[PDB]
Design a binder for this molecule. Structure first.
Ligand SMILES: Nc1ncnc2c1ncn2[C@@H]1O[C@H](COP(=O)(O)OP(=O)(O)OP(=O)(O)O)[C@@H](O)[C@H]1O
Ligand SMILES: Nc1ncnc2c1ncn2[C@@H]1O[C@H](COP(=O)(O)OP(=O)(O)OP(=O)(O)O)[C@@H](O)[C@H]1O
Ligand SMILES: Nc1ncnc2c1ncn2[C@@H]1O[C@H](COP(=O)(O)OP(=O)(O)OP(=O)(O)O)[C@@H](O)[C@H]1O
Ligand SMILES: Nc1ncnc2c1ncn2[C@@H]1O[C@H](COP(=O)(O)OP(=O)(O)OP(=O)(O)O)[C@@H](O)[C@H]1O
Ligand SMILES: Nc1ncnc2c1ncn2[C@@H]1O[C@H](COP(=O)(O)OP(=O)(O)OP(=O)(O)O)[C@@H](O)[C@H]1O
Ligand SMILES: Nc1ncnc2c1ncn2[C@@H]1O[C@H](COP(=O)(O)OP(=O)(O)OP(=O)(O)O)[C@@H](O)[C@H]1O
Ligand SMILES: Nc1ncnc2c1ncn2[C@@H]1O[C@H](COP(=O)(O)OP(=O)(O)OP(=O)(O)O)[C@@H](O)[C@H]1O
Ligand SMILES: Nc1ncnc2c1ncn2[C@@H]1O[C@H](COP(=O)(O)OP(=O)(O)OP(=O)(O)O)[C@@H](O)[C@H]1O
Lengths: 217, 217, 217, 217, 217, 217, 217, 217
């Protein structure tokens, strides 16, 4: 009975609730707009019209029952701030809030929100990376310098071996996976071929990988 | 270098432009809202007030020249749609568009957008995984079943060795990295220690990692 | 049981439904504005308030029953586009859509509308023809060059014969009908008189007719 | 040549002005919306921003000089009405006005408009005929009962001769034209062939043509 | 059973109905605004919310029963015009309409309104007369030259006689009434005194009276 | 001559200014609406854009100089009230204000307006008298009971003599004027004829005139 | 049964009613906005939605029962004025009204409001005093010159005696109270210590106190 | 001298600025509304149009220099909040903010405002005391129980001596001042007379003063 309540059904909030529901958790959907509540009614355990800045409505939902509450209101700063503050004063263990700008972040930080999230901003960065470097499909940064990257293989690697493309010595990186025709190879061994348009998961330093990307592929 | 046009300086569009500019690419920042143009003036090569649905304004920007055009308008479907169409007829190589819902996705597809992105939806899914599992700090899905996961170490893992935690045989998963106090250990050998509250990077099957999480940590 | 549904009750949509009803077909009238639905309630088999961009409402009407659906929404491009797309995905055989401008035409074309109609634009042309040439009551173009025209006869034709006004040799046109005092003569024979203010239906080349209009009448 | 003023650059008004200009007549394009004036600047002799209900602006345009004035305002009854009245008192020869509904028609009639047009309504009727009868591509009504119709030929008509299809005796109707692959056959002789998917132009009584359609094609 | 219906409850319309009711006539109060209908509910025989431009509502009131209908809508020209036209077509014997400007007068005149009234304009004149000439309390014009005026008497007439102030010979006017301390004297005889601040009713030529006003009072 | 300020160029205010200007008095026309200032520019000595509630603007107009100030604002109570107060504190001799309702009258009274006018209300009463009695063209009430009335002559009065119609004895009323075909007969002698459709001017008691109307005409 | 009614529930009005209720008086809460009425429903004897400018609603509340009525509407001048006037005419003994500016004060004064209050303006002054003089916690003016002030004691008074800080001779002021650690001493005697950060209540001339504030503390 | 910035020229903010300026301190008057800047131009050292939430505008005002900044925005929570935060990060010594409700208070507290004021609420309490007790003209609370009160003398107190009214023993309270006809008697001796309608200033316990009021006056 770990209960989640998602306040604000926007694209971000909507997705969290829709997803949490798919996982088979208990989720309460909360939105001031009636139509939204109708929309996500299928995708939550309970859907309720509520003005989340209004304390008595908030109490009527039985919000003190929830371990996690998500304020997925990032356009209306005042609604967002007021709801978060209410939840803090109502002693909610985890208050996760969508933030709009650096300033909205600060107030939320100050009023005691447990996690502040910038979904647009973060993906903006991620896509910009993929934009400049048309080779990066996906990735994850380990630290400021070290990073795991998923790469779409060019024709300058078609049918080449792991040992052929020596990266652990030649480029200081390690290869972790190949994905060919949907089939997946993990921690692939020294003799393994890589074909054009496969998925390649290289791990190392950011600059090291980009080096490899230059002369390698 | 590479020429990029970012039409619509939202929170998502704005990040792309800000980030790409930090990478030092030629970025044209376009918005109909004057104050947005004024806001991102420091973070672009050229920031211009334009109505991106108005064709003559689009030629006045000289958009035909650009390799990549990003429509970061995702609230106003009509603006988004109408612009993408304009850019298509104008023979732009790569048109990447921010989408709002499944149907706005569909029209973009049908008018031939090159890449459609749902930043909020995708991020929603990500955070939702992090919500039901407090241990996962981050992750990347290699495929429907296989995934590389970043985990926050608990007390059950303090002073534990890689050989002690036999993931490679017991769980079919492999550890890739350990982050201790900001210091970073890549593709670490079996003698190495994991201290609590550190970043642990495991790789394997989804159901297999969850298995490790349960009995392991 | 060929069923027609007319979505959007404007002047154009309204007329289609009002007319189709007069013919004794089955017609469903659909408009988001309640008053419109009340208006055309007499002139349809069934009149229903619906927001046609909303799929569940659209399904509740039982729209999959209709062989022909007409989206007579030309001011609101976004409502028009979204409805058409919905209907395409719901596998409607014939989707006829009112278009507003060249661009709205294109998107509709791309999303797979079966016939795009520009009722204002077309009549604008037709009347402009009648405007310059005060003699043309009505007409129909056969091709870019050839055209059937209905003409109001001047005093320079009063009581003249078919043979007198020889057009098949002298002007390369053929006369098809005279309409005098409401009485109608078809394929009128060589001796037939034509009186002032009668209706004359000439068939030929566009330039040929205008020639006739100059020296003839 | 002839002087025309088109007040109200709608989709209907706009077409008149665009078309008349292609014919090379002197067309004054008037609208209260600046952006409309800007849009049709290429398609007129003089395009002016004016409030057509304001009398002094109407003298500043010098409208008394024009032979033909077209009020293409059909949404805003008050603007339409008030303007027509202004033009009447200003002794304009021909005032043609776009009408919205039967009552807006009535006032225009009563304030002495010279020609009232319902472009959407009329076109609605036309398309509706085409809807119930997929064969009719176009048509012109000579009177309440007699009409010239353009038909799309089916398989039942392929390789058929004009003498084979005796319309002149069997159905009281006469064929006027055949269009094959863009090529055009006018007032064709009895030996001529009709191939499927061609344009066929028949003339007669309405009920008679429908009769031919039924058993013939 | 002479029935009156007052459509439009403004200051002017409201007063007509309120007054007609006081006289003990049958009056129907009609206004689109519900509150107005509530207001005049006491002051009419029947008060009904109706949109007077809507024919079926108009028919539901049973408007064809009324000998006199008053359209007391002078701000909204379009509502006024449309209602009047409706009433004309519904064959109402007397249609009295409040007009706003010279143009609104003309259309009403043309569509066949039986009496057009300019309540503001008329009183504006009347008060302006009283303004310049602080002596004129009230008056009524007989023709362009001849006029009956009510006058407040100065100290230069206090205790003077009818014969003393000879106006029928000296000024070509005739005196008709004196009103002293509320008591009224009619066709007052040659010996009658007039005191300061009495009411004096002089009849004659406009210029004649003003002459009297100069040297007399 | 005399200085007048007309604040608020309504239909009522506008008439005062237009009329007073025709009389050739110095009239200052003030309105907050620019287009009103532009409209009455021809009909005043000085027409100025001003917010009459703003004190400094009121000194910039130099209103202290004027003998008469007319507040012809009767829809906007707050504007009306606030202005009148401003003018009072500014020691203006005569403040005449247009009032909307009984309570707006009351405040004006209490803030010391010199004359309060209800043009619509008063005119409403007048026309209402004319409605129930088609014979009364015009009138003036001398007091609660005594009144001078202008009557439209019927068939019952055609070719009738003043001596024949003994009003002075039979009805206690006196005839004052006869208007025949525009020609005017003042204080007419007993031999004089009244022809039908002429203006008749009777004087007496209200109930007495109605009495004459009934049996007389 | 001294009844109070608070019309207008703003911050000021709300506080009056909330407070009067705490005291255990009978209070009627009145606001046009429904939500406000719901808000103060707990904090009044009776809470009622009413438009206070509407007389019949006002009468339905039974407003003639109240000894005191408070019009706590200071933003909307017209609503405030109209309500006050209504209450005057309904013969309410005490009409206390919140005023917005000097002008709104005047009209209220003129229409006979019993007390006019400027809550913002007054506190603005009070705080500005505390602002310049960081030593003044609170105070009360006796007249234009004489004033009782509460003062926060500096380190230049820590552990000093009443006789030590002789003010009745040295500065012409008298000390009335010390407040130390919450404990209160009144009319404190000559030997009494004063510690840093205590509360000191000095009484005298305004200039006298400020003198003391300079060399004393 | 001391530098003060008053952001938001409300009725409360406006008074602070007007008063502080009368005291002759350097006051910067900031508002987003141009007309407010224009209004208080006479009552400040520098009056500037600025959006106080916009950071660059805040540096353009040079706000870092000021010792005291007052946020007198209390309707617009978001503006208020966002500004206070800006000023905090900009290291301003004293930030005094006007608050609207308990929750707007809370955020200000949490973002570290130095003093939060509720001018309406506080004043509401004050007047409410004056309402239930017509005798109290003014007062100051020394603590929860002890208070100095200004009283309006009744008939029961006329010609009464300080010794006659033994408050110091009978009621535990002490009289501090008597105001007679504007003349002022400070810390008055026992022989002194109180005449009716004078200001009386008593000091003691709250319940004790009420006791005196009951039996005394
Ligand atoms: N006080 C409130 N109580 C409950 N729901 C609210 C409240 N205020 C806003 N919402 C809802 O929460 C959602 C928040 O999304 P919003 O419109 O603020 O933009 P956004 O967060 O940038 O959108 P997205 O989540 O797609 O990025 C909306 O559906 C809105 O109706
Ligand atoms: N026709 C247009 N031409 C240029 N810019 C436009 C046009 N229409 C919208 N924009 C801009 O594009 C941006 C798109 O953001 P929008 O407000 O539409 O919602 P959103 O994309 O969901 O927001 P976010 O990116 O923050 O999630 C806005 O900054 C807007 O000013
Ligand atoms: N989503 C919707 N669902 C159903 N009906 C709609 C929807 N959107 C608009 N309509 C209706 O369809 C009609 C469409 O006409 P619209 O106002 O778009 O201008 P128009 O098509 O140019 O007018 P006309 O048909 O006279 O040329 C309107 O009556 C409108 O109320
Ligand atoms: N007083 C006026 N003076 C000049 N132009 C005007 C005036 N009023 C309206 N217009 C213009 O006339 C045009 C009339 O089109 P409108 O938007 O009224 O509906 P419509 O005529 O039904 O549209 P459509 O012609 O596309 O069917 C508009 O472009 C409008 O800007
Ligand atoms: N279509 C309609 N049907 C019925 N009543 C209407 C309609 N349109 C307007 N009214 C009402 O009739 C009244 C007409 O007054 P309006 O607001 O037009 O200004 P006005 O005539 O200048 O005012 P006044 O009569 O005081 O001079 C209003 O009360 C309005 O609510
Ligand atoms: N503060 C102001 N200063 C100057 N002029 C104003 C102000 N407020 C209103 N006006 C003008 O005064 C006129 C008053 O007419 P309003 O529209 O208020 O209704 P009304 O007096 O009932 O109309 P009417 O006189 O036609 O019956 C308007 O022309 C308006 O522009
Ligand atoms: N006619 C009316 N009848 C009853 N209540 C009203 C009326 N008009 C306004 N109110 C209410 O009274 C209150 C008055 O506050 P208002 O919004 O006028 O600003 P304010 O008085 O400056 O606010 P505050 O009292 O906080 O200083 C509001 O809650 C409003 O809803
Ligand atoms: N971002 C901003 N920058 C500068 N000034 C602002 C800003 N936002 C609001 N203001 C101004 O601050 C003032 C604050 O008053 P507001 O109207 O918000 O209500 P209030 O403070 O309750 O009013 P009052 O002080 O009269 O009780 C207004 O004059 C407003 O124009």
């Amino acid at each position: 009975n770990k209960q989640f309540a998602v306040i604000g059904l926007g694209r971000f909030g909507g997705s969290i609730c829709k997803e949490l529901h798919r996982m088979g958790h208990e989720v309460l959907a909360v939105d001031i707009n009636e139509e939204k509540v109708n929309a996500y009614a299928s995708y939550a355990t309970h859907a309720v019209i509520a003005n989340a800045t209004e304390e008595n409505e908030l109490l009527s939902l039985g919000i003190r029952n929830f371990e996690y509450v998500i304020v997925a209101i990032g356009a209306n700063i005042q609604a967002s701030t007021l709801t978060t503050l209410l939840l803090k004063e109502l002693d909610i263990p985890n208050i996760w809030v969508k933030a709009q700008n650096y300033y909205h972040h600060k107030v939320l930080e100050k009023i005691g929100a447990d996690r502040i999230i910038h979904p647009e901003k973060d993906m903006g960065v991620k896509i910009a990376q993929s934009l400049s470097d048309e080779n990066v499909l996906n990735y994850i940064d380990l630290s400021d310098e070290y990073s795991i990257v998923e790469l779409l293989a060019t024709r300058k690697l078609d049918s080449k071996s792991i040992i052929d493309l020596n990266v652990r010595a030649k480029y200081g990186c390690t290869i972790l996976a190949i994905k060919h025709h949907g089939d997946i190879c993990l921690s692939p061994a020294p003799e393994d071929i890589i074909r054009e348009q496969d998925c390649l998961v290289i791990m190392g330093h950011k600059k090291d990988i980009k080096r490899f990307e230059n002369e390698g592929m």
